[PDB]
Structures are given as C-alpha cells and as structure tokens.
C-alpha cells in the first residue's frame, strides 16, 4: 500500500455514487421547477458523468414518477478511437436498449 | 479468512442498503396510492429496518 498512487489501482466504491446522490441532484430539479411553471420558458438540466457504466448513466433519468435530468449527457461515440460498423452498431444500441 | 462465519465478523457494506434500494421502496408506495384515492380509506406502509 505504500505503491497504491495512481487512481486506477482502487475500486472507488465509497467515493463516487453513494446512497442519497442522486437525491441531491433531484432536489436541484425541484428549485429549478419554481422557475418553470411559465409556458415557454422551461428550465434544462443535463448532467455529465463520464468513465461510467450504461446502466449507472441511465439512472439519472429518473423514475416514471420522480423527475431528475431531462437526459445525462452522452459522449459514447466520443470515446471511439478507431470507428468501425460493429462499434457503431453497439453504442447506438446500448444507449436505446438502456436507457427508459 | 477460513474462521469468518459470524455475521458480526464482517461490514456489510456490499449486502444491505445499496443504491437503488429506497426507489423500490417508493415504487411500493406508488402501488398502493392507486388504492388511496377515495377519501377515509388511505392505505398505510410502514418499513421494519432495526
């Protein structure tokens, strides 16, 4: 342990995304909604969360019943170093299999 | 790590209360307002967590 410097020698499974997270960032949609009851001028919000799973972005959709990010931000096609017609193919699918 | 057999032994960080735990919880709820909407017969839920 007197080696373990570098961030992607740890699991970070106390430090990022932890129990009552996500309440925080729908609280934020819910100040946000005091500004959005005139027609016309609704209020966006997006969140960035990136080197993250398809199924932990997703969440930030939120729940048929609980409002959250209207969508978390994509950059899977940005994360294409080489392009191909299969790798394409998968991140076009993951994202509307995934997502609700 | 051969002993470890008492569930005090151990934090339990990874089996009890995870991400996405209290949603499931509120989905419950939204259930059961479907049957709350006529007036004197709300129905109750209560959590046992000790």
Same mark, same amino acid.
């Given at each position: 342990?007197?080696?373990?410097?570098?961030?992607?020698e740890?699991?970070? =499974?106390?430090?990022?995304?932890?129990? &009552?997270?996500?309440? *925080?960032?729908?609280?934020?949609?819910?100040?946000?909604?005091?500004? @959005?009851?005139?027609?016309?001028?609704?209020?966006?919000?997006?969140t960035?969360?990136?080197?993250?799973?398809? =199924?932990?972005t997703?969440?930030?959709? &939120?729940?048929?019943? *609980?409002?959250?990010?209207?969508?978390?931000?994509?950059?899977?096609? @940005?994360?294409?170093?080489?392009?191909?017609?299969?790798?394409?193919?998968?991140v076009?699918?993951?994202?509307?299999?995934?997502?609700?």
């Open positions: 342990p007197d080696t373990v410097t570098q961030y992607s740890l699991y970070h =499974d106390f430090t990022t995304t932890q129990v &009552g997270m996500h309440d *925080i960032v729908r609280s934020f949609r819910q100040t946000m909604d005091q500004y @959005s009851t005139e027609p016309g001028r609704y209020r966006f919000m997006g960035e969360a990136y080197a993250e799973s398809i =199924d932990r997703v969440m930030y959709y &939120g729940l048929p019943f *609980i409002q959250e990010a209207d969508f978390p931000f994509n950059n899977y096609l @940005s994360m294409l170093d080489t392009v191909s017609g299969n790798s394409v193919y998968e076009i699918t993951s994202w509307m299999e995934n997502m609700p």
